[PDB]
Amino acid sequence: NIAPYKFKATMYYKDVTVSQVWFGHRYSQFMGIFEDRAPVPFEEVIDKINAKGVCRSTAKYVRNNLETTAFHRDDHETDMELKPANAATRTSRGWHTTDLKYNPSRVEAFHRYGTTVNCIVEEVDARSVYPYDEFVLATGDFVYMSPFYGYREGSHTEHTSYAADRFKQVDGFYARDLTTKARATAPTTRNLLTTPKFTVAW
Amino acid sequence: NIAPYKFKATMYYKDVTVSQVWFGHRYSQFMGIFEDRAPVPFEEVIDKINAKGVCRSTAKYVRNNLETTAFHRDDHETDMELKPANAATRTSRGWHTTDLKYNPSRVEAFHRYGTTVNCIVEEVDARSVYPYDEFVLATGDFVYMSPFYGYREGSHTEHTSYAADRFKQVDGFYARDLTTKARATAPTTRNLLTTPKFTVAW
């Protein structure tokens, strides 16, 4: 068998984007743009995205050993409704909360920083090969954890590179279909891993 | 037929590079560098590069929903002559206007921003596969538009993902050879597409 083990997985991440704009006498210029994929915590993936289909308007995560907190448009935390992404040929379903990137208002001879947090959730096809100790995603991101890792029936013996607090298993999980706003009638065992740049659920 | 449809295409883009430098008491350090590929508008590709073989010393384009304008060395707009790029084994012809990257002058305990705009034009080999609804370039950049898209003889029915204003077709186009400074004796139906990061002509 040379075909890699293929299984369905769902990614959850926020495209944190803070840009620096220089406002001249008659023009505007980008002095710097910092793009980062902030992962979504288990509490938000369960109690906000799966439970209500909404994402927090702020991105709280650890980056370079610092607890960074990004606010969309520098506004207070607010529940943003998830909507389907733009149509694309040969692409899996995906949803996002924001479309337009935010930049600061125009003030003369001054630098300003405008943060943008766009919650994004996508359904990606995961692949794995023998010894099945790790798997990749459709976006090309590697996940150093066995797809069968878990706490039940000896699954804890599988390979894992992340800390214990970075993995969570939920039993009787009813997947919420964001497009048709429906709830699966089959309780499923859902695994959750919070990678440094994204959160995957399979 | 498994061989992808191969055709010649020309890319046009400007390497906008603005760097932040911190000048210490006895040293210099880069506090941040922002590199971006600004596309070249149709007016410049026709009236400046093809018509006269020169590129504007400024990069005006849309990035993250903002009309950013970058000036080379923070100087006024000027016509820069295009010259061949450095020799490289197994590489297609390419030309550029600037070689040395610009940085701000040294002023003590102060941060400074120096913008660099280097117009770049290259001949790349484009490839496409069935249904031929999109094609890639030698640089690995995808172009979500059918290579045969156009306004003539039913070509408008081909697939396209960009807006109408982002595509332009020119009839009787005489390609200007920047190296031998020659004009082709054969009129061609040149197609032009302004992608968010570059402009391709085939």
Partner: peptide, 18 residues
């Protein structure tokens, strides 16, 4: 898929200015 991110999760033509 990676290059389709901008066209799928963001507006490419809308311009905002003040």
């Amino acid at each position: 898929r990676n290059q389709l991110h901008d066209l799928r999760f963001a507006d490419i033509d809308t311009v905002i200015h003040a």
